[PDB]
Amino acid sequence: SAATGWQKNGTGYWYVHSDGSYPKDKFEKINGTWYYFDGSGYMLSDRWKKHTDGNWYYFDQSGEMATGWKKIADKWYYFDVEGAMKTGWVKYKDTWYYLDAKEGAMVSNAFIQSADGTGWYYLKPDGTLADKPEFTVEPDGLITVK
Amino acid sequence: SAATGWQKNGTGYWYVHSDGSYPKDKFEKINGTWYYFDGSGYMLSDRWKKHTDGNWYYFDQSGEMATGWKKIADKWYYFDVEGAMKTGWVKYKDTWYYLDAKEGAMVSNAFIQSADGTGWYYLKPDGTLADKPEFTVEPDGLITVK
Ligand SMILES: C[N+](C)(C)CCO
Ligand SMILES: C[N+](C)(C)CCO
Ligand SMILES: C[N+](C)(C)CCO
Ligand SMILES: C[N+](C)(C)CCO
Numbered sequence A, B: 001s002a003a004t005g006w007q008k009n010g011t012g013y014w015y016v017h018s019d020g021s022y023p024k025d026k027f028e029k030i031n032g033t034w035y036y037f038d039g040s041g042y043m044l045s046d047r048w049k050k051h052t053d054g055n056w057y058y059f060d061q062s063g064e065m066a067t068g069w070k071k072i073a074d075k076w077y078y079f080d081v082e083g084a085m086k087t088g089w090v091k092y093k094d095t096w097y098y099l100d101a102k103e104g105a106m107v108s109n110a111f112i113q114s115a116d117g118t119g120w121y122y123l124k125p126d127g128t129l130a131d132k133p134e135f136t137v138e139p140d141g142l143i144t145v146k
């Protein structure tokens, strides 16, 4: 906790073990919290990382691995309990949400094709699933949903 | 997960067990996360709670018990790992912070009297402890610190 723990040489943070010594290019758990250190010892803060397990990870300005829902650059993302960004459907409370399969951001006000390519799910403006959507159709074929 | 879990009757969220039944006026852990439900079964969201253990707890709009640093109404608070709002000194990374003993918000740009009433600690504008503060004094007795 003096020459042994969180260190700061201007550019960023690194961390010192009694002796392992300082993590680089890996994850580390520190007082209960996961961080990632770049190839040069420096903690990632406010940054996306695409890991070796094919997952996307986010680290806040503080360096803490994101877990659960997190608004980032004005878009929602859900991260599983082990910090992996999720895509597709997720259960949150009483309802369902859908996260782009490409960028991973929550989708809203959209039709999502069903897995078997046969049908659709509508997600409202706030992103929730419509359990009971309502349609109206005008003569030109214009559709409103609610 | 249908007539058995997160429920929503307009006013707020309540939660149904196979059969305990629905928590009221207590904490509950649900899929790894702690919530609090008022005397009437409803999940607290975006709210301070003063618990029966004499601690202050915060619950975000989502209802999640706050843990770690959390900015709330434009002030910082550190919550211990079990969600109890902390006061006094805390260790964060390479430095120290001080949280008001009264309201619990982080203190910045201030002198804090040492425990034994004998000396002082200065915390900068961003709230960090000054390990090496510098003073200058003008003829009227005016002091700058840095
Ligand atoms: C150990 N440092 C983080 C200071 C530099 C690594 O090259
Ligand atoms: C200054 N804090 C410790 C409050 C957090 C900065 O990310
Ligand atoms: C979409 N979220 C569930 C992340 C929050 C909405 O309040
Ligand atoms: C399990 N994590 C992905 C959280 C880090 C170690 O691999």
Ligand SMILES: C[N+](C)(C)CCO
Pocket: A089, A096, A115, A121, A129
């Ligand atoms: C509940 N949904 C069917 C919308 C998602 C599962 O694929």
Ligand SMILES: C[N+](C)(C)CCO
Pocket: A048, A056, A102, A103, A104
């Ligand atoms: C998936 N991200 C949005 C995190 C980066 C682009 O691949």
Ligand SMILES: C[N+](C)(C)CCO
Pocket: B009, B013, B014, B022, B040, B041, B042
């Ligand atoms: C939360 N409930 C609606 C189940 C109880 C109200 O008295």
Ligand SMILES: C[N+](C)(C)CCO
Pocket: B027, B034, B082, B083
């Ligand atoms: C232990 N907690 C305070 C986190 C909840 C139950 O009291």
Ligand SMILES: C[N+](C)(C)CCO
Pocket: B089, B096, B121, B129
């Ligand atoms: C080390 N400080 C004196 C800053 C406070 C610890 O109780």
Ligand SMILES: C[N+](C)(C)CCO
Pocket: B048, B056, B102, B103, B104
């Ligand atoms: C007493 N607190 C400042 C902790 C909460 C605001 O009412």
